[PDB]
Design a protein around this ligand. Structure first.
Ligand SMILES: CCOc1cccc(B(O)O)c1
Lengths: 237, 300
């Protein structure tokens, strides 16, 4: 059924699985019209589909043209997401297809289940974890490819860079979720932490800086402090 | 007018015939029910005084043979049987009526209730849902499961209702996933009505039969089927106008007849609130919405 803290190591076993986050698919700016009404303008979005064991990220860029002339866009967005996930699965060799797909929002369950009826053996599950994948667009290289896209496009990344050479998937996922939680809580402070030291750079083929093991421990601690700070500033503690 | 004669009433039992129920006492002078309206299916049902477990009964149509009831002390129930000896049957029934050994089906002449509950129900279609081709009448009870229920265990003792499942490949056209899931008209009109039922009269007949098995036997799978067939219509944006008008009448009489004390277990809150207040047809069921709001406002 649902995925929670009790069955958390399941993410890192050898059954292929994918997380799907749709929170950045339909993105708008709200603004005033010349007549003083309010209107939205869509901007490019993305589906965030992640294998938590390998770090493989299938970033499907959602170009604003897909919304043209369509109604009820927030509902369409869930069905478009499910359509694209289903297309991705069909594109993969059978031995690479996931055995489970975990959606980060329960409103994706029925859309994905319907699109995946042809795959009765693939389990579609919710999660009680509140995962910070909405902050994927605070990773500069992912945000850049989304905003520059002029047409629908899929781009593949490893969201763990080379970390798995040195740490386990469990630890790599914990790092990722801590980094994204911090970026979600205070993007500017998080980025300052990540890029303060100009001698630590981001390789052309990476998303995150080339921290040594020691430095990652320092970084990870600083990101905890930030999350604690904002929790203090927020709740006045 | 036709007659369901008994051979005798050896165990105390509540007997029902359509919407009427009466008690028969441990060894009381009882040879059956007379004056049964010809032209409708009927159901004669039983609940033993000593074990209200298992309501059970028989759907039959007197135009299809001479039927009687005889208790079986081995299987412990009242069984329906056909008499092939027509002269024997008439003699027996006559003899019985002379001695006033029968209760009277009391049809108020103003009253169209049973017609309105069974308008589309046909014995031939009942016998396809209830598979026992050697008898002209059909046995149903509280515990019989449906084909769909058996998918999710004796195939011969099951109710073969038409399986309806909104997240199924039958319900959903490849490439119309959102459209077909949010608007069930394809499933209703092409798959079910044109494809499976052939016409709305057969669809309504199964719907009415499912309701009556739910109400008279507490059959849970029948209740599921009744609600699924309602939801399929109300969840379709495109429904023939005549079907919506008839559905409103059908449901009206079903809600009117439902025992108030059973509404808690026979009415699915989610289906009814969705159908009456959120669905494509939320404003097409005027009579049904009025009786539901005045009789069962708690459910809503
Ligand atoms: C068909 C036999 O109908 C009867 C006979 C006596 C009493 C009742 B009653 O309404 O509870 C019904």
């Amino acid at each position: 059924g649902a995925m929670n803290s009790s069955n958390y190591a399941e993410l890192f076993n050898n059954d292929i699985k994918l997380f799907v986050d749709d929170t950045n698919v339909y993105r708008v700016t709200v603004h005033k019209t010349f007549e003083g009404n309010v209107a939205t303008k869509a901007i490019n979005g993305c589906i965030f589909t992640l294998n938590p064991k390998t770090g493989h990220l299938f970033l499907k860029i959602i170009h604003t043209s897909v919304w043209a002339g369509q109604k009820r866009l927030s509902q369409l967005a869930k069905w478009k997401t499910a359509e694209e996930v289903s297309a991705l699965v069909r594109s993969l060799p059978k031995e690479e297809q996931p055995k489970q797909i975990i959606v980060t929002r329960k409103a994706m369950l029925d859309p994905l289940e319907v699109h995946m009826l042809d795959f009765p053996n693939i389990a579609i599950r919710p999660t009680e974890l509140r995962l910070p994948f909405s902050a994927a667009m605070s990773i500069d290289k992912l945000s850049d490819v989304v905003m520059k896209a002029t047409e629908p496009q899929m781009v593949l990344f490893n969201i763990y860079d080379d970390w798995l050479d040195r740490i386990s998937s469990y630890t790599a996922f914990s790092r990722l979720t801590l980094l994204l939680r911090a970026l979600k809580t205070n993007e500017e402070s998080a980025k300052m932490i990540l890029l303060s030291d100009p001698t630590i750079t981001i390789k052309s083929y990476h998303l995150w800086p080339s921290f040594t093991d020691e430095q990652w421990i320092t970084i990870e601690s600083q990101m905890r402090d930030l999350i604690l700070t904002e929790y203090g500033r927020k709740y006045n503690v | 007018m036709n007659t369901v004669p008994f051979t005798s009433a050896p165990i105390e039992v509540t007997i029902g015939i359509d919407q009427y129920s009466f008690n028969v006492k441990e060894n009381q002078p009882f040879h059956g029910i007379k004056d049964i309206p010809i032209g409708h299916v009927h159901v004669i049902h039983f609940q033993h005084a000593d074990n209200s477990s298992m309501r059970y009964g028989y759907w039959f149509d007197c135009r299809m043979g001479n039927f009687y009831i005889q208790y079986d002390p081995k299987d412990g129930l009242y069984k329906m049987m056909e008499e092939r000896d027509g002269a024997k049957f008439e003699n027996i029934v006559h003899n019985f009526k002379e001695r006033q050994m029968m209760v009277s089906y009391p049809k108020i002449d103003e009253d169209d209730t049973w017609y309105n509950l069974t308008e589309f129900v046909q014995m031939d279609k009942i016998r396809k849902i209830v598979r026992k081709d050697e008898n002209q009448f059909s046995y149903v009870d509280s515990s019989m499961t449906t084909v769909q229920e058996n998918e999710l265990s004796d195939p011969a003792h099951s109710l073969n209702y038409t399986v309806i499942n909104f997240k199924s490949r039958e319900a959903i056209r490849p490439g119309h996933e959102m459209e077909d899931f949010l608007d069930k008209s394809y499933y209703l009109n092409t798959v079910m009505l044109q494809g499976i039922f052939k016409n709305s009269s057969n669809y309504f007949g199964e719907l009415q039969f499912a309701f009556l098995n739910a109400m008279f036997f507490g059959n849970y799978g029948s209740s599921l089927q009744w609600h699924a067939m309602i939801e399929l219509i109300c969840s379709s944006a495109t429904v023939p106008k005549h079907m919506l008008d008839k559905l409103d009448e059908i449901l009206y009489y079903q809600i009117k007849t439902l025992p108030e004390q059973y509404s808690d277990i026979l009415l699915n809150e989610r289906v009814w609130n969705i159908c009456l207040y959120s669905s494509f047809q939320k404003n097409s069921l005027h009579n049904t919405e009025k009786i539901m709001e005045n009789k069962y406002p708690e459910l809503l």
